[PDB]
């Protein structure tokens, strides 16, 4: 779509994003070295993160895996994230 940048290099990438307002600012581009595969640059204060688009074996896409080592990181993390995925919920007495 619109954030989607193509070919466009990874150090052009970090310019342009540079250019811009709000953290968060971001495209999505081909990856430098992957062939087939996707980076995604985010403006965030004073850098450009880049993140490597990760596909599974059945081709799906995500950044990370989301799992925990405890009951406790599992609550701390949807104190801000949603615990519903079609309504927004988070926390507690
Ligand atoms: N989605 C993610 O990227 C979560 C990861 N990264 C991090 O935590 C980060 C998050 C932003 C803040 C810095 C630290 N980033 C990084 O480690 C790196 C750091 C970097 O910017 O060099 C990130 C990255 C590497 C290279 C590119 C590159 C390319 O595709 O050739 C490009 O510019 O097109 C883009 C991104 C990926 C490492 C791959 C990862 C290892 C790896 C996984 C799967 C396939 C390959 C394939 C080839 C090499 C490495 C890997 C480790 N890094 C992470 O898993
Ligand atoms: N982009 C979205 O937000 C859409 C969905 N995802 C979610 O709600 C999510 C992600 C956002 C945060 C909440 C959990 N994910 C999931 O629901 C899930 C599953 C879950 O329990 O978390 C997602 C999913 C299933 C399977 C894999 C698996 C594989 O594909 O073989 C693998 O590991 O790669 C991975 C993911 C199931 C989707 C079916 C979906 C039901 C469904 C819709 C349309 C067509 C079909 C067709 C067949 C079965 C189910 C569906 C429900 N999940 C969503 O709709």
């Not at 940048?5 to 990874?10: E, T």
């Not at 990856?31 to 074996?57: I, M, T, Y």
């Not at 895996?65 to 599992?74: C, P």
Request: charged share 25%; no cysteine; glycine share 6%.
């Amino acid at each position: 779509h619109p954030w989607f940048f193509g070919k466009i290099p990874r150090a052009k990438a970090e310019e342009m994003l540079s250019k811009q307002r709000h953290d968060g600012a971001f495209l999505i581009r081909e990856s430098e070295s992957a062939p087939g595969d996707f980076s995604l640059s985010v403006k965030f204060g004073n850098d450009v993160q880049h993140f490597k688009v990760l596909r599974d074996g059945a081709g799906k896409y995500f950044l990370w895996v989301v799992k925990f080592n405890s009951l406790n990181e599992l609550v701390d993390y949807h104190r801000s994230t949603s615990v519903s995925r079609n309504q927004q919920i988070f926390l507690r007495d």
